[PDB]
Design goal:
Chain G: Keywords: Acetylation, Electron transport, Membrane, Mitochondrion, Mitochondrion inner membrane, Respiratory chain, Transport. Chain G: Belongs to the complex I NDUFA7 subunit family. Chain G: This is NADH dehydrogenase [ubiquinone] 1 alpha subcomplex subunit 7. This is part of a larger assembly, with 7 protein chains of 7 kinds. With 318 residues, chain C is mainly α. Chain C contains 12 helices and no strands. Chain C is globular, with a radius of gyration of 20 Å. Chain D is mainly alpha-helical. Chain D is built from 13 helices and 3 strands; from the N terminus they run αααααββαααααβααα. Chain D has a two-stranded antiparallel ribbon. In chain D, helix 6 runs antiparallel to helix 11. Chain D is globular. Chain G has 55 residues and is mainly alpha-helical. Helix content of chain G is 20%, strand content 0%. The chains are: A mainly alpha (70), B alpha+beta (176), C mainly alpha (318), D mainly alpha (298), E alpha/beta (155), F little secondary structure (96), G mainly alpha (55). At the B-D interface, strand 1, helix 2, helix 3 and helix 4 of B face helix 2, helix 5, strand 3, helix 11 and helix 13 of D. Strand 1 of chain B pairs parallel with strand 3 of chain D, so a sheet runs across the interface. Bound molecules: cardiolipin (CDL) (2 copies), ubiquinone-10, 1,2-diacyl-SN-glycero-3-phosphocholine (2 copies) and iron/sulfur cluster (SF4) (3 copies). The site of one 1,2-diacyl-SN-glycero-3-phosphocholine has 6 residues of chain C, from loops.
Chain lengths: 70, 176, 318, 298, 155, 96, 55
């Protein structure tokens, strides 16, 4: 009956779920938890580049709060 | 008595034209077609699980041929050649000869199952119900020669499907 | 961590089309009261693998009148174009955050038709050239409506970035503001991918072939997997563009689950219409777009240029 | 510009092979001419042989003929429309109504023995009487067939794609159809009110009431509608045949034309001799020429 | 072991072959009507993996359904020679097997065998749609007992 | 059998794992049905052989054989009649 | 293998008619396949007298 159709969907739905989960988790994993910063314009990229220089370890996502200055 | 199948003229009032226009833009008969395909999706499929669920037949079914024998054991065919004479495709070849004991039967009774049309005329013509078409229809083979049955293979069929052919003619002899 | 990301997209994509061929027959059969494949594995869960493995072990052969080079590259064109097109799709966070993602998918999708006639022309067959010439004017005429429909809808976006659709239809589904354009968008997607109110590209009834004329195990598999992948996306693109979903920035899995469900529902509808309508004749499918879709297309365009201005609802460019 | 239909790709020598066989032996050939009109084909040949023999079948045999003749008209019409939908492109109504065709195939097998080539209708009546309880199944199947017809026609009759694929296509005139030798639906589909079931009634077709669906435009769409309406009209003819089936024998009570009953063939001298001669030589028919015709489902 | 490895590999290929047969319909005569009933939902040929596919370049088995007339005999050979050839031929009905009813005609070849090699023979006139399903099932068994790799390993 | 199922699936057979020295665990055949049960299974009658066994006679086989095509047990057609012309036997005597 | 009422309402509404009344599958209304033996009648000429073939 029609419920026999569902296994056809399930093995596809899980397969289609992987790219959404993999990309979301890889970005978080490769950027220290926070989402990958998006730079649609040069001003966003300028913040990112200044983040890379400021962090010292040349990592844009590695962020320094108030404790960097004193 | 005749009926005009397509002589419907649509109305020109403001209501009817809008419905046709609504049908045109907002595809409705297409949705009605879609809506009914959904109805058949939820229904009960009619597929039968072959070969676990074989199809329904009738006692009159015509399949693989077989020569039957009397309850005593002696064959029913007395070589009258009625089946050979009435075979529309001439698939029957018969050769007879006086047997050692007297009453004589065929020495060659070959049925060409690749020339047979399975019309059943042989089983009607037979005055002793010797040649019959059994219920089997699953005797497909890999080689053409295996189809060309002779007396021995047909007699084997009679000794194999007898438990079924006996019941079929038992249920159908009164109709004939 | 990018090769892992790419291979976390290519393998799920090819497996999605892989079992879409099973949910095709198992849905097509049930809609025509059949049962579909349920022999190879439980409920047919292994039939496409049996299909695929055969289609990479049965003798391939180039036609005697073929053009070898163009005959071979056309499957390359079809498959690579289909895969590369999924790239900017914004499943929570898109794999490649293109600034002009919409224009990108339009450009490459307009390229997936070079495969169909390069295959047709190189095959040097009468049915091949007919099917090739049927398809090209089919797609490009359906492409004019494809471009304008996208533009009219995206005028409320303020940009061509695919990620912004998540923000645009945050509270209200986009279809509730552009449903007239949604209908022709769905029809055009049925037409660019050559499903079967306009499957004349294959034209099996009148042209026996045309998607893959003499194409064999390998190349036939490509030209199939290159168009069934387009089936899944062109509904994923429809899902992302019209039927938005809630996206919590902390738990993207809810959006991916919702996004997948909309693609699955849309894909079923692609299979659903496929077994509920006859075949459009060539002049009809061209007449439908050049004479009925386009006049409504331009009119609703002019509406959507003016609409934000009259209501003072110009979306933010950024 | 021109359509030259090269035929002869299946020119089996039927007309020459018939000469070498007897009249009974030539019966299965007509089942194998039109793969779908089985009893209708045998009915035409049976009428021709009976007309030469100046012999009529018993009333029960005639009613079974028209009953299975109309069932056959359902069979051809079911495939004619569905394969027309297949070639057009609509593949779904193919499978629904070919489930019913299997249901009618059971009736063919339950009466004659074979599912397609019944070899049932024979000169002088029919081979043997209906198996007990067949009429009930015929009534059960016909009860729901009205719905199944509505299932077919609802998805195509009003379907914009379907009409555009058939409306104003293959239009023929009235006199053009008459001169070209067109018959059956093609005259009916283009205004010509002609149907052998009413103008020249054969068997007991003068007792059943039905309506012939005359078409108006004459294009593909009108004829397809005529086919569907002819499908519905056969149900009334089926209904009348089921409700008015008379008692009696199923073959002409004359051993020199129809074979005697098996009970008598094993009991009496004359039956055995007639059975022997009828199945070896056959029934000699008076020297003459005839041209019978029936409203075949095509 | 090398023989064991070739044994499993052969089974994998043979499973992929028998589980996907795509007939190229040569519908000729009343034998074709019964075959379509096999495609009808009563028997559902599709459910066995076997689904009808045109374009003999994309088909595996021929199902000769009907009489083979001498006029079209070149067509049968040509469409047989164009199949990517892991390929098999199924003959349906007495006419296709050896001529059947028209065995003695002037324009019917006495069997489709004289034009093409023939795998499993399906007898009948017509063979019921269930009988053909048994025939296709027999071909699947025949494909199962193919030792192509074992022979290659022992060449 | 299950009468609630629609006519066609109300009866079914689960084939045996082994018959006549041929494993059929994954190799079930449609001809593996004995004739007595073949009648009931095909809906040709409603009387299972347990309730109504067919009449027993000597010539009826005691072991059903499936399709023996392919296996080295096939049926090879051959002439069932003797010779017709008797060749003259030459005399072995050295003559003269 | 008669389905749940939820499907029946959906199945009926999607088609637009009561499908449970007339169904495409024969459940039990069919005639039993084991019918009592019949008694066929005889033809009009089955007479012991005044039935000469010349007439
Ligand atoms: C732009 C660069 C174009 C370079 C060129 O000459 O392309 C010819 C190439 C082949 O022409 P053809 O009409 O197929 O004729 C091939 C044989 O002459 C006719 O067919 P064939 O069966 O002889 O084909 C085999 C043949 C030709 O080689 C091939 O078919 C192999 C693939 C093409 C190689 C070039 O092999 C050889 O000649 C020996 C190769 C060692 O035509 C193209 O359009 C290919 C352009 C590829 C550009 C880069 C795409 C990425
Ligand atoms: C949307 C889908 C929601 C989930 C499925 C719900 C469903 O259709 O349940 C069947 C059930 C009855 O369906 P039916 O076609 O009327 O059943 C007719 C006979 O009773 C059918 O009689 P029967 O004896 O054939 O029924 C027994 C059958 C019953 O099978 C089931 O109930 C399958 C679904 C539950 C597991 O179980 C089996 O045949 C065993 C094999 C099961 C195959 C694998 C099922 C996978 C389900 C999905 C897994 C995750 C993906 O559906 C409903 O009552 C309506 C559910 C509506 C859910 C709306 C959600 C929003
Ligand atoms: C008219 O209308 C019509 C249609 O519709 C409108 C139709 O639909 C159809 C179609 C017909 C039907 C649906 C009917 C039924 C028919 C079928 C179902 C046919 C089935 C066909 C198939 C092709 C089967 C598909 C099924 C499956 C299961 C496919 C499964 C897929 C696979 C096995 C492959 C999956 C992918 C894999 C394994 C990828 C692996 C990748 C890797 C390992 C990585 C590769 C990459 C790298 C390593 C990158 C790194 C390398 C580098 C950098 C190299 C660098 C090199 C240098 C030199 C520099 C027809 C005919 C039609 O008529
Ligand atoms: C993913 C698929 C995994 C399984 C793939 C297994 C390999 C299949 C390749 C195609 C079949 C041919 C093969 O295996 O060997 C070729 C070999 C090639 O050598 P061969 O001599 O046996 O080839 C066949 C015989 N001639 C040459 C006369 C045509 O052939 C066979 O194995 C077939 C026997
Ligand atoms: C690039 C190359 C990559 C290669 C990767 C290696 C694996 C590739 C192929 C993997 C599957 C091959 C088939 C192995 C099993 C097999 O033969 O099955 C058919 C065979 C067929 O047997 P059969 O021939 O008896 O079946 C037909 C006959 N009847 C119907 C009567 C039984 O069945 C089995 O082996 C039974 C397996 C049962 C479990 C199957 C999996 C269920 C779960 C699936 C989940 C989704 C998966 C995706
Ligand atoms: S059923 Fe076959 S063997 Fe018997 S008479 Fe007809 S053609 Fe000849
Ligand atoms: S009809 Fe019967 S008895 Fe006469 S030859 Fe044929 S098998 Fe023998
Ligand atoms: S064998 Fe019989 S059914 Fe098949 S094509 Fe020949 S005459 Fe027709």
């Amino acid at each position: 009956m029609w419920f026999e159709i569902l296994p056809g969907i399930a093995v596809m739905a899980a397969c289609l779920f992987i790219p959404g989960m993999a990309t979301a988790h890889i970005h978080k994993f490769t950027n220290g938890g926070k989402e990958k910063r998006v730079a649609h314009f040069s001003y966003q990229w300028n913040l990112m580049e200044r983040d890379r220089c400021i962090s010292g370890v040349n990592r844009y996502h590695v962020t320094k709060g108030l404790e960097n200055i004193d | 008595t005749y009926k005009f199948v397509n002589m419907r003229e649509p109305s020109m009032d403001m209501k009817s034209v809008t419905d046709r226009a609504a049908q045109t833009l907002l595809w409705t008969e297409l949705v009605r077609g879609l809506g009914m395909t959904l109805s058949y999706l939820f229904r009960e499929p009619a597929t039968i699980n072959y070969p676990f669920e074989k199809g329904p037949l009738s006692p009159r079914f015509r399949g693989e041929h077989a020569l039957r024998r009397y309850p005593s054991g002696e064959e029913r065919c007395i070589a009258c050649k009625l089946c050979e004479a009435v075979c529309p495709a001439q698939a029957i070849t018969i050769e007879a000869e006086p047997r050692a004991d007297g009453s004589r039967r065929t020495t060659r009774y070959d049925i060409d199952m690749t020339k047979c049309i399975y019309c059943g005329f042989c089983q009607e013509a037979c005055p002793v119900d010797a040649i019959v078409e059994g219920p089997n229809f699953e005797f497909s083979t890999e080689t053409h020669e295996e189809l060309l049955y002779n007396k021995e293979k047909l007699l084997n069929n009679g000794d194999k499907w007898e438990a079924e052919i006996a019941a079929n003619i038992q249920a159908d002899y009164l109709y004939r | 961590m990018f090769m892992i990301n790419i291979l976390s997209l290519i393998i799920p994509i090819l497996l999605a089309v892989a079992f879409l061929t099973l949910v095709e027959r198992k849905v097509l059969g049930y809609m025509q009261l059949r049962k579909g494949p349920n022999v190879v594995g439980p409920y047919g869960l292994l039939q496409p693998i049996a299909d695929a493995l055969k289609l990479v072990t049965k003798e391939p052969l180039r036609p005697g009148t073929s053009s070898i080079s163009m005959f071979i590259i056309a499957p390359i064109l079809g498959l690579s174009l289909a895969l590369t097109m999924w790239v900017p799709l914004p499943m929570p966070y898109p794999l490649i955050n293109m600034n002009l993602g919409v224009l990108f998918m339009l450009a490459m999708s307009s390229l997936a038709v070079y495969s169909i006639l390069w295959s047709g022309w190189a095959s040097n067959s009468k049915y091949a050239l007919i099917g090739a010439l049927r398809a090209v004017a089919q797609t490009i005429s359906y492409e004019v409506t494809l471009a304008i429909i996208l533009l009219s809808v995206l005028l409320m976006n303020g940009s061509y970035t695919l990620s912004t659709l998540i923000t645009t239809q945050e509270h209200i589904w986009m279809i509730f503001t552009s449903w007239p354009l949604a209908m022709m968008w769905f029809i055009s997607t049925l037409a660019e991918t050559n499903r079967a109110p306009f499957d004349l590209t294959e034209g099996e009834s009148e042209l026996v072939s045309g998607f893959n004329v003499e194409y064999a195990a390998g190349p036939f598999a490509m030209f199939f997997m290159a168009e069934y992948a387009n089936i899944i996306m062109m509904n994923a693109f429809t899902a992302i563009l019209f039927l938005g979903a809630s996206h919590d920035p902390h738990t993207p899995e809810l959006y991916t689950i919702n996004f997948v469900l909309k693609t699955l529902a849309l894909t079923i509808t692609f299979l659903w219409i496929r077994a509920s309508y006859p075949r459009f004749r060539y002049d009809q499918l061209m007449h439908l777009l050049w004479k009925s879709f386009l006049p409504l297309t331009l009119a609703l365009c002019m509406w959507h240029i003016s609409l934000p201005i009259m209501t003072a609802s110009i979306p933010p460019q950024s | 510009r021109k359509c030259d239909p090269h035929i002869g790709l299946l020119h089996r020598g039927t007309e020459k092979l018939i000469e070498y066989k007897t009249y009974l032996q030539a019966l299965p050939y007509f089942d194998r001419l039109d793969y779908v009109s089985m009893m209708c084909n045998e009915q035409a040949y049976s009428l021709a042989v009976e007309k030469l023999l100046n012999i009529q079948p018993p009333p029960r045999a005639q009613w079974i003929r028209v009953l299975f003749g109309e069932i056959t008209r359902l069979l051809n019409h079911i495939m004619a429309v569905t394969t027309h939908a297949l070639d057009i492109g609509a593949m779904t109504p193919f499978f629904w109504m070919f489930e019913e065709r299997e249901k009618m195939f059971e009736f063919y097998e339950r009466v004659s023995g074979a599912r397609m080539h019944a070899a049932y209708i024979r000169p002088g009546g029919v081979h043997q009487d209906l198996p007990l309880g067949l009429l009930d199944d015929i009534y059960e199947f016909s009860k729901n067939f009205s719905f199944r017809i509505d299932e077919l026609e609802e998805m195509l009759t009003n379907n914009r794609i379907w009409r555009n694929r058939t409306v104003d296509i293959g239009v023929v005139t009235a006199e053009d159809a008459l001169n070209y030798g067109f018959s059956g639906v093609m005259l009916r589909g283009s205004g010509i009110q002609w149907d052998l079931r009413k103008t020249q009634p054969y068997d007991v077709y003068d007792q059943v009431e039905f309506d012939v669906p005359i078409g108006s435009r004459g294009d593909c769409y009108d004829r397809y509608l005529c086919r569907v309406e002819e499908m519905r009209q056969s149900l009334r003819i089926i209904s009348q045949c089921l409700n008015k089936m008379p008692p009696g024998e199923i073959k002409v009570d004359d051993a020199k034309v129809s074979p005697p009953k098996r009970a008598e063939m094993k009991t009496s001298m004359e039956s055995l001799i007639h059975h022997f001669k009828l199945y070896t030589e056959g029934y000699q028919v008076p020297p003459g020429a005839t041209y019978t015709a029936i409203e075949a489902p095509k | 072991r090398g023989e064991y490895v070739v044994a499993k590999l052969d089974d994998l290929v043979n499973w992929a072959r028998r589980s996907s047969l795509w007939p190229m319909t040569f519908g000729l005569a009343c034998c074709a009507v019964e075959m379509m009933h096999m495609a009808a939902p009563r028997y559902d040929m599709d459910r066995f993996g076997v689904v009808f596919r045109a374009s003999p370049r994309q088909s595996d088995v021929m199902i000769v359904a009907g009489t083979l007339t001498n006029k079209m005999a070149p067509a049968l050979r040509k469409v047989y020679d164009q199949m990517p050839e892991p390929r098999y031929v199924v003959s349906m009905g007495s006419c296709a097997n050896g001529g059947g009813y028209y065995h003695y005609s002037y324009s019917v070849v006495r069997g489709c065998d004289r034009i093409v090699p023939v795998d499993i023979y399906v007898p009948g006139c017509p063979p019921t749609a269930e009988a053909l399903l048994y025939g296709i099932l027999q071909l699947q068994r025949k494909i199962k007992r193919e030792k192509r790799l074992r022979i290659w390993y022992r060449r | 059998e299950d009468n609630k199922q629609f006519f066609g699936r109300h009866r079914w057979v689960i084939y045996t794992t082994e018959m006549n020295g041929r494993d059929t665990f994954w190799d079930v055949d449609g001809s593996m049905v004995p004739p007595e049960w073949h009648r009931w299974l095909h809906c040709m009658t409603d009387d299972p052989p347990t309730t109504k066994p067919p009449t027993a006679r000597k010539y009826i086989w005691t072991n059903h054989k499936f399709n023996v095509s392919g296996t080295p047990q096939q049926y090879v057609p051959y002439s069932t009649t003797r010779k017709k012309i008797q060749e003259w036997v030459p005399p072995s005597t050295p003559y003269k | 293998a008669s389905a749940t009422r939820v499907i029946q309402l959906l199945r009926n509404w999607a088609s637009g008619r009561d499908l449970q009344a007339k169904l495409q599958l024969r459940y039990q209304e069919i005639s039993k396949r084991t019918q009592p033996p019949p008694k066929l009648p005889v033809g009009p000429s089955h007479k012991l007298s005044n039935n000469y073939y010349c007439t």
